[PDB]
Every structure is written in structure tokens, then in C-alpha cells.
Structure 1
Amino acid sequence: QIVYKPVDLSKVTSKCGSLGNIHHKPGGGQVEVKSEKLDFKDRVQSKIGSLDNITHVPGGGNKKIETHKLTF
């Protein structure tokens, strides 16, 4: 007899009184790339020649990850 019975009662929580006055001001820039050949196969993930800017301000932004497995 096999019984699998994990119990989860957890909390991930935040409080923030006021969130703001955020300034993001990058001063440009320059990028150059040279190549002759590219050859990509099974599950390649790639990024060539970027100049990318991100502002990310979540009011919460909490994460939880679970993985429940049984196997014979």
C-alpha cells in the first residue's frame, strides 16, 4: 500500500505603505558584433547584439514554486 499525502498551509505575504518616486534614465551606448556562421540545434536559447532597458515595479511581486512527484 502506497499513500502520498503532503499538506501545504503556507503563506507568502507583503505590506507596503506607499511605493514610488522612481527614476530610470540611461545615457545611450554602442554595440557591435561580427560573425561568419551560426548553427543552433536542440533547445538553444540565444541573444546577440542588444541594448535593452527594463523598469519593473510590482506592488507585490511574491513567488511560490511547487513540484509534487510519485513514480514507479
Structure 2
Amino acid sequence: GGKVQIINKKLDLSNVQSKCGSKDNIKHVPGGGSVQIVYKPVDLSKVTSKCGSLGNIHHKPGGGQVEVKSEKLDFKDRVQSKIGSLDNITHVPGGGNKKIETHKLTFR
């Protein structure tokens, strides 16, 4: 018959801030003629502010409980592909350029 006693008096808590930056995939692209791939971004982040909070309360003297919490996250991947291919490209951001060529020949 044990006793748990938690007395809180005159508690003044303030300014508990938790901030995170932006997570943008493809943003602000004025360039062109490119290949930009973001392949499978997985986000399991956690931004948390706790201020004067309590957890779970479990008063179970002499009990035979079975508490099971399971969180199975599977990301098995079998990737046999062709990602991000770019060729036969002429890219001229400059001005006043003359006689630019790009030739490709292929025989099979």
C-alpha cells in the first residue's frame, strides 16, 4: 500500500518554443534544362513542446497485465532502374556566342 504524492504550488512557466525549418523538395529553380529528382524522402521527424505536462498514470498494484506496443515500419526496396539520365545537350546561358554544335552518333 505505497503512496505517491506530487504537490505543485505557485508554478509560473512561460516561453516554451520548439521550431523547425522548412523541408522543401524542389524549390526556387530559375535554371532550366536540368534533371532534378528527389527519390523517396521519408520524414519521421517530431517537433514537440511540453510545458507542465504529465505522462500516463498506471495504478495497477498486484496486476498481471500484458501491455504490448508495436510499431513495424517496412521500406524494403528493390530498385533496378535508370534514374537521372541527361545527354545530347547544348546549354548556352551566355550571350553573343557563335557556332556551338553538339553531335552524337550511335550504331548497334
Structure 2 length as normaliser, TM-score? 0.14
User: How many residues are treated as equivalent by the alignment?
Assistant: 72
Return 5+ residue gaps in structure 2 as ranges: 1-35
For residue 6 of structure 1, report the CA deviation from its aligned partner. 0.8
1:68/1:35 Cα in 2 relative to 1: closer, same or farther (>3 Å)?
Answer: farther
Could you tell me the percent identity over the aligned residues?
A: 100
Q: Which structure has the larger Rg?
A: 2
TM-superposed CA distance for 1:10, in Å, is 0.3
Higher RCO structure, 1 or 2 (CA under 8 Å, sep 6+): 1
**Structure showing the higher strand proportion among its residues:** 2
* Post-superposition offset of 1:16: 0.6
Following TM superposition, the consecutive aligned residue runs of length 4 or more in structure 1 with deviations greater than 6 angstroms are 18-72
Point out where structure 1 has 5 or more consecutive residues left out of the alignment: none
- TM-score in terms of structure 1 length: 0.20
Q: Deviations over 1:5-60 (max 9, x none)?
A: 11000000011118999999999999999999999999999999999999999999
Q: Kindly tell me: are residues 54 and 8 of structure 1, through their superposed partners in 2, closer, same or farther at Cα, counting changes over 3 Å?
A: same
Q: Which residue of 1 aligns with 2:55?
A: 20
| RMSD after superposition | 25.6
**What SS does the corresponding residue of 1:55 show, helix, strand or coil?**
strand
Cα distance change of structure 1 residues 36 and 61 upon mapping to structure 2, 3 Å threshold: farther
